[PDB]
Amino acid sequence: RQWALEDFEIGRPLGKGKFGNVYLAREKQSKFILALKVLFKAQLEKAGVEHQLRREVEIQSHLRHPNILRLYGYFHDATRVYLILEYAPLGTVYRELQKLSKFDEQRTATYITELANALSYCHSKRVIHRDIKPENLLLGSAGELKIADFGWSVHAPSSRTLCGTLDYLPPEMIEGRMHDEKVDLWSLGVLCYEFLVGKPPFEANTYQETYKRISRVEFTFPDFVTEGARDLISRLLKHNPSQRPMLREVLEHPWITANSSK
Template identity: 35%
Template sequence: MLSTTPTEGLKDPEIAELFFKEDPEKLFTDLREVGHGSFGAVYSARDVRTNEVVAIKKLFYTGMRSTKKWQDIIKEVRFLQILKHPNIIENKGCYLSEHTAWLVMEYCIGSVSDFLKVHKKPLQEMEIAAITHGALQGLAYLHSHAMIHRDIKAANILLTEQGQVKLADFGLASMVSPASSFAGTPYWMAPEVILAKVEEQQYGTEVDVWSLGITCIELGKHCSLLLCSKF
């Protein structure tokens, strides 16, 4: 049950089975931070068993709101273990260490947002089309399983070294459609999601398509959505 605290949750066999029992500190070396946020941090690392480079998202569940943090971690871990698609980030295992969840995933060279920051110019139409096509393939898979991402934006669309598009970050995703909770990032958020907060209305998978449309503007204009909203 998602309502359990971290201590109670690990006594539940169904939840305990979501995590490998090994100590991740012994399995992954050469950790280097490549991004961070209020949730924790993302690292590149090397798997000592295979020598493969992986990405590790560390999520902390101590301190204030620890129960809510734990619930969010369980939800994201369940998403990662269910999803299997070429345009969805690949899950490689989840571990626990000192009140921190280690979500191990395939390594990508960066997000589309990172790409924009490095090149400091808008993307070309063919580049936007390629990214949008990959993102739509991933969304079609999610939506066919009645799931909603709810946080589509350039920062959550990753690229592999071979240029493959991968949807990532399912911390705000919904396992059911329609949904009614308020979740997402404001500038990319569909009106239906905003109305869900003020009028308790339901919305479906179409909200991801709206967010992807805003992302296309983001890619073409190469500016913050705050500035884009003024154009």
């Protein structure tokens, strides 16, 4: 069906995107509640990311997994583009991380499991998300994690568009080098550390400074991180992409098994 803005009643803003906001919305005919990612064509062109936005719609609309946010369709007009997304009721893992400061091992390992499963599915299709970070992880009604925002996804292998914060990016990406699905493994390790510590392992006040840290893989554990968490995070944060484990090995790691709920 060919959609149009008149088909929806827009509600409160759910977030600030990079080219517009996301709104809670209801489809007039079915009363279906969902989200509307609104991007201004102006900016989309000024950044020449129409290829990304196309890769986002094309990749995400074809994914079908309970731990991956659903993209139902899209439409647009003289001015903007509208992505029709599955609405995540419980917000971002990011906000939850602000609220709780840091997660316990049970919550952390559970989120990692849902992620690994979701990434496994994405890697079976040779799809690399490449932008795994707290603000792209949404929570379902039952509090289940759902990877969202495929605005950077691309099929492996690949090269590289400009950047923002490097916090979750692998050395191979910040060094412009070629990369594959291993990129997401590095990010998963960054997340696991951030979940337990309250902040990313390579954080810094300077972009230049953060680049050095990621490049050198310079991170240390606070005393309260258990050895089981340190082992997993250390296997995940290897400079050489090839050393990074398979998602299966993550899903099976002892620390994950002993702590995870799913």
